[PDB]
Ligand binder design. Sequence first.
Ligand code: SU2
Length: 278
Amino acid sequence: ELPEDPRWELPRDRLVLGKPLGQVVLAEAIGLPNRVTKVAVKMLKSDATEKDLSDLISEMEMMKMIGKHKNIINLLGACTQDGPLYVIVEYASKGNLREYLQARRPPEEQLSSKDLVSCAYQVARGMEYLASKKCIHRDLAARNVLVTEDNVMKIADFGLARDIHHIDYYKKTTNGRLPVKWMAPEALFDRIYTHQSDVWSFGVLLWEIFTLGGSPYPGVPVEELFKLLKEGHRMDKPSNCTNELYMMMRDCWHAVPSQRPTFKQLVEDLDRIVALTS
Ligand SMILES: O=CN1CCN(c2ccc(CC3C(=O)Nc4ccccc43)cc2)CC1
């Protein structure tokens, strides 16, 4: 039923399926001839519907068009014939950025100020490329940024299929958080997603980096959040964060979308700051 694509197809016998990472499983690919590469494999569950298959195929086709970049999860290959569709993607051995940051908080080794600003820069870089490829993430957060064994930040879930007119606002993440806390007011209230709302989300992501896994608006429910946003509320400056970096966050949270900086700008700024960061 699935169309063959010689550009990305890998024989099934080349993919040794391993431990589930979260369905996404860790695996080893032989070749990609006599070397094995640890990869992540995305697949469907038994109780899945043809819709679920549709979405999975959509995410793969999306990854194909977007192309490669050091700071995004890249497509490595796929097993589409004679069996369950397997979408082989890059493996991130250190999990998501939130956890990575939390697991290094002082009472695993602590991160330096330069390390933190460097984390931000790489994320801005992944986004700059995605934006240039005409892609709107719609859910940029530290939970959706993965860290490789080499500490390379990689943006994930950028090719995901989603119905904005079907988003349950009263739904928590696996860790029990409310995704609406990363959405720009225009995206949340007017359902208007742009590279600019992604910038708003980047400001929230920056805040998580400088709070080392901090939760945005603890104890604040959907209804109260709407009110904060309507009143033009902005979170406080994280301790151990320069005024310069807080200003960046504040700039990303500009009420007017057109006045927010672009990822191209952010990349220039962060590139300059990193070098000035001890
Ligand atoms: O305590 C240590 N660890 C570190 C690794 N981690 C972890 C958990 C999940 C994943 C998933 C994962 C991945 O590695 N690549 C990729 C691409 C798309 C979607 C999901 C993924 C990758 C690593 C779990 C916890």
